[PDB]
């Protein structure tokens, strides 16, 4: 989850101001402009920090889920669990931030493609990696990228 | 040439009596018709990418990335202004459409006419025609024997 | 034709399904930071309202004329007939709204393409599509002009079939 709410018994020492931002709970983007277009959409699963595709079908309005390829629609940069809604940056808008990488093979200067699970994998091209993949926890790898569209 | 403003000074006072054909100067930064809802970025400048297509250029890793004149399959945006003191380049991302005066390749510049599709070369210069949608909206204008500028509209990727 | 289109002898007769009007507000979901541009259009060649348009630089001004997806500059969302001025949303921006189609039977979720007349058609016609267009609703006829709700988000990397 984006913010796993767990109670603690001791305070965690947090004084160093470096290597503090690469975390799974840091939503949004590293650099954001006031004129960035944002859309909230109903979602299924957990597409947080992943490429999202718009799925269209009691009939319901279209929702979004993790995906990519020819069906890529945007990027989910923030999520709200109570409302079950996800803030999405459309693919027509450039973005800079940390996204989910398939594995640790991704390095700097690497051109990346959103796979069927919304994860960034090495090689149409969509983004250019800026840093190496870092393991946040278990198999979760986060990579800083500069999304620019589709080739 | 290598500076947005004329490097040398001038020995005359401008007449400032006419209003037609006064925007052909090289120092005319920014777009000709600009929207208030335009996303604008800045980056450290490597070289002089002024009024040229820019691409991401990296280093060993000790320093942050910067932008240099370029194009083709590595095009990232268009540089419209540069602050020389800070060495910062104003960059308009390719996902945001642009309309203004851009540097034109000095090769077949006479053949360029309104309605001619253009594309960016490896040196960030517009050349007559792939993957970037650019349309010339005027004819080439000569500023220096090797410097030609043309009014063009860039509206994304093909 | 026109958008406003007239004195009536009597008034025309729930909240549901009242948006099915030719002169309805084009944007189903609007957003500030959407870029809107003004251009001239030909007042006798083709009426560009709710159609995909292309830039034609003429010898006197830059006009917008109905065009295909291959050379599309954007979508004409509104027209001021008094000044014959067309308002264009560039293709670089997202769109979600009602556009003119020529097929009266289009289902929801189908892939769509803009033809030479700036008209929504099914993407199975054969021309390689270059834009991501999806039908958000079934096509409806106003009695006659056919409209459909579509979502347009940027260009397609590799042209499909």
TrEMBL record, chain A:
Top-level division of the source organism's lineage: Bacteria
Keyword terms: Plasmid
Family annotation (Pfam families): DUF228
InterPro entries hit by this protein: DUF228
Protein name, as recorded: DUF228 domain-containing protein
Species annotation: Borreliella burgdorferi (strain ZS7)
Organismal lineage: Bacteria, Pseudomonadati, Spirochaetota, Spirochaetia, Spirochaetales
Automatic annotation (TrEMBL), chain B:
Native source species: Borreliella burgdorferi (strain ATCC 35210 / DSM 4680 / CIP 102532 / B31) (Borrelia burgdorferi)
InterPro entries per the UniProt record, alphabetical: DUF228
Annotated keywords: Plasmid
Pfam families assigned: DUF228 (PF02989)
Protein name in the entry: Uncharacterized protein
Superkingdom to which the source organism belongs: Bacteria
Automatic annotation (TrEMBL), chain C:
Keywords of the record: Plasmid
Domain of life: Bacteria
The protein's name in its UniProt record: Uncharacterized protein
Species of origin: Borreliella burgdorferi (strain ATCC 35210 / DSM 4680 / CIP 102532 / B31)
